[PDB]
Structure formats: C-alpha cells, structure tokens
Design a protein around this ligand. Structure first.
Ligand SMILES: CC(C)[C@H](Nc1ncnc2[nH]cnc12)c1ccc2c(c1)S(=O)(=O)CCC2
Length: 167
C-alpha cells in the first residue's frame, strides 16, 4: 500500500491525477476497486483497462463467478482475485444514470468500500455512467469510513474536484 503523490482531502479520503492501472502496478494494493456492471462484462472504460492489464484473466474469472452466482445488483459488489494488480479486486456496481438507474444507489455502491481497511478506487458512476463527478466525490467523502485512495485519470477533472471540495 505504497501510495505516493496523493492529496489528503479528509481524514480517510485521498485523491491523485493518475490512471488506476498504473497506480495498481506501482502500489500492489491489498484491494483495487473495479467500476463494474452487473454481469461483470469488462468491455471498456475503467473495467476494460483493469481487465487488459490482467491479460484477460479477470474476465475469465468473472464469467465463472456469474455462471455460479448470477449477476450483481446495482449498488452491490463481489470480491474476486486481484491477479497481478492487487491481492483482491472489489467489483462494485454504481448506478448508470445514462441508462435510467437511480442516483441514490451511489451511496449503496460506496458503502461496499467499508468492508476493506484500505482501497485504491476510481470515482464511481463518473465518465459514461453519467453521474455528476463532484456529486460522486461528495457521496464518497460522506459514506466511506475506511481509507480510500481515488485515482482520477484526467487532470482537468482532478482540478475541478479539488477546487469544488476546498471551496
Ligand atoms: C472520469 C474518468 C476520468 C475516469 N477514468 C479513469 N479513472 C481512473 N483510471 C482510469 N484508467 C482508465 N480510465 C480511467 C472514470 C471513472 C469512473 C468511471 C469511468 C471513468 S467509465 O467511463 O469507465 C464508466 C465507469 C465509471
């Protein structure tokens, strides 16, 4: 859990302008969070980048999890292997508001982080899931009580997040 160059926002939330894949390789955290969908199909975005970095091992394991257990619910999670990126991957499903899913489930999604002492995570429901990223950071700060290191791979969004939080 050798995190470097993060800005501490609150006693338990830290943020960095960085690609979560590059962070996982440098840090080898105990837990990396994937911004998953309910069938664990890692077709693009953050999930696609994490799966590519495992040379598709994450997708094969995920398909075998879904066959045996069925899909996740929106707001839910499962713990699978971290492969070469971490000890464990916490696959968390935030709501996709661009597909009509309820934004209130973002609180449920961040509540899954509280079962793990330290996590490397992306900003849930941001990007093409359509949530307002400043709202997602506020939900994270108000909900997560364990130690979370957010990697946001966009300097423009990183700067807007830090400015809106420190105002
Ligand atoms: C908002 C961007 C900058 C961020 N991308 C990334 N953030 C951190 N490490 C990365 N590596 C490659 N991409 C990123 C991000 C945050 C959450 C989500 C998405 C994208 S999405 O569009 O894949 C849909 C799932 C939710």
């Amino acid at each position: 859990n050798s995190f470097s160059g993060y800005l501490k926002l609150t006693d338990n939330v830290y943020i960095k302008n960085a690609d979560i894949v590059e962070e996982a390789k440098k840090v080898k955290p105990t837990v990396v969070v994937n911004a998953a969908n309910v069938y664990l199909k890692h077709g693009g975005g953050v999930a696609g980048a994490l799966n590519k970095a495992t040379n598709n091992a994450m997708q094969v394991e995920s398909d075998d999890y879904i066959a045996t257990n069925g899909p996740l619910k929106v707001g839910g999670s499962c713990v699978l292997s971290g492969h070469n990126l971490a000890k464990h991957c916490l696959h968390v499903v935030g709501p996709n508001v661009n597909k009509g899913e309820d934004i209130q489930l973002l609180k449920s999604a961040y509540e899954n982080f509280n079962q793990h002492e330290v996590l490397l995570a992306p900003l849930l429901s941001a990007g093409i899931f359509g949530a307002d990223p400043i709202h997602s950071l506020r939900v994270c700060v108000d909900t997560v009580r364990t130690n979370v290191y957010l990697a946001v791979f966009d300097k423009n969004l990183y700067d807007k997040l830090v400015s809106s939080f420190l105002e």
